[PDB]
Assembly symmetry: D3
Homo-oligomer: 150 residues x 6
């Protein structure tokens, strides 16, 4: 169903390298509808909440430090298989091995600084969406382009 | 001084035609720093507040109706002469006469549906900025690219 | 009214320099609806018909020779003030003085080889449209994006 | 040999979403020479002819309905291994799984509405070319850029 | 005549902001032929030689300091009225007032840091060309695209 | 380590088809720092030196002939895993099979004329770098964007 939403965050390096317009534009071209969008500086607890899955790991500290070291542009897109696609569009973990055409393959070069975040599954998606956005901030009446779906 | 901020809003047609990424990207290229960003559906009073200057006019009703007829992506950019430039980048009132290269000249075709809004002066800028964004939502520590200014 | 159509032809140099996709795309972005499109090699009489206005001139011969020296991609776009805009988008006669952002200013460099043709007035438009296209070849039910016009 | 031609059609959604210029431009960049180009609304029999291979299938009806539900921009490109490449450029059947960089991966999101058609083999290519274009409509003297081939 | 050459230098900010590919590409699109290209860090005397015209001025010191504060990508393009056009493409002195579409209007924001240099006249052009490049470094057999000139 | 450099050369067809700006720009986006850049016409011995690895082969003659048949824009980029990435960005040997998004997949169509050269390994990289550039021509103080690496 085309009511699937995912959560993506242009991390501090993406924002600070001026990649915001490029990234949103890529998903708008693909056809996905922007449902929520806000630039914010993540707070310690939000970051720790977001990188929960790694809190038992050594490199969790970094995660959190960075994500809160500067503004992040958070957004939620909706469309058929959006969670799946978005990842495809974003690339692999290591920017260097991400293929040309993908967000990280085109602009990425490190793994720590890999510009963007995308929920890895529909489950992490709904956890992430609700975690960063208040229901108030999300669109309801989406209504996607009718030339997009059969 | 490069602490000048302006207010721009991608109106409903711009957002609905997928022009969001293009527009933000244009200002990021130019060098301006994104200080505030949020997609929202304007409310009657906010719209009436925003199109105040025309409330005594007949065509004020339209203004308000439209601006609230769909999501709008509001944003505030900061940089040297940002208010002046942004307008230059956006084009004239009539999209048709806006020159190629400008936002409205490239994508615009009507005047009513002219994709974007930009504060017309630094005064309307500060009124508009504070009107659409809560201080909480705006960056403080801007820190612009050092290759931008002498 | 937004039922105005104009006639544009990517001349042989434009086609041969691979400018076809760029040009059509520019008008599609602007919002104009493609009503007729066909690649053809103009014939002597069609060319002489098209450059009629100059048949009494010395440099009419050239005009005709060139326009028929290779394939030309002819097309008709429709939209509010399309005839006016299209010219604005295309640039001036001398490519060199056409401004950056315009078709000829971006890719043009000579005046003889100035990539594209655009009807100069709505009158020459209807003469040109009917001259290059058979009514069969033109769309009827245009139906332009509703986010384009108020 | 570089006299290989393929047939591609920007279906109704591609045309109606303004993807025409983008698509032609992509093949012009790659180096392929545009041999035939025309926008037309396919007719029932032409569509049924084109989707012949599926006439015994249930979902043949859809195929035909759609392809004729709006204008289609048909074109024929020629170049070394054009049939093979074009497909590579266009993407897989499911837009969602088409990779970033490909036509369907960049702009596609459904499978039914997958923007473009490309002959699947050189055989279907020649059947498709001759089916949509009259020999009159196709270039003869192609003459491709000499910096393209050894 | 189309044997006119001009001299352009992407100053340190342009190079350091990653504008090199964009700028060269813009002139290649326009049709001009790249005759000389080299990245170098200007030396005091070369810079003082280049900003000679201002040596009697107070702000000559800055000029020189900057131009040598980092690598510069120097290049010479040739084409009909190249000196005139290039300037048109580059924009005015103040990036902020340069129009959208122009190099400085699109990416520029200060006047001191205005990304690029272009000879202001054909005279300063030949002085600048010979000053930064050794004849060895410049192409001789230019041979421009035949679809560029009548 | 991010002090890895590779050597790339836009061969004669790439340069002559106006692909120079596009290619440099792609690597600048990815984040790599331009360390050396110069347009030159390779000489017989330099070409024979460069295509040494094939001198015992029949098709070595071609290699050499071509590479010296016109100007080549040589350059050296530096960054984390630059040698690996650059190849990924450039594509496979056969342009036709290179994937969309890659340099050769987007603009390439033959194998002989495949636009660009990239050192195939870090070893061939250092041999190639030193072979085409004099140490004088290469940057020392690279200093890459701090938003690129962790």
């Amino acid at each position: 169903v085309n009511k699937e939403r995912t959560f993506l965050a242009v991390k501090p390096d993406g924002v600070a390298r001026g990649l915001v317009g490029e990234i949103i534009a890529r998903y708008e071209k693909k056809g996905f509808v922007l449902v929520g969008l806000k630039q914010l500086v993540p707070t310690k607890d939000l970051a720790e909440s977001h990188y929960a899955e790694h809190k038992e790991r050594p490199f969790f500290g970094g995660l959190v430090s960075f994500i809160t070291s500067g503004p992040v542009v958070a957004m939620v897109f909706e469309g058929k298989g959006v969670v799946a696609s978005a990842r495809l569009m974003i690339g692999v973990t290591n920017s260097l091995a991400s293929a040309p055409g993908s967000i990280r393959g085109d602009f990425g070069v490190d793994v720590g600084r890999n510009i963007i975040h995308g929920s890895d599954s529909v489950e992490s998606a709904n956890r992430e969406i609700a975690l960063w956005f208040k229901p108030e901030e999300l669109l309801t009446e989406v209504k996607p382009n009718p030339n997009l779906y059969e």
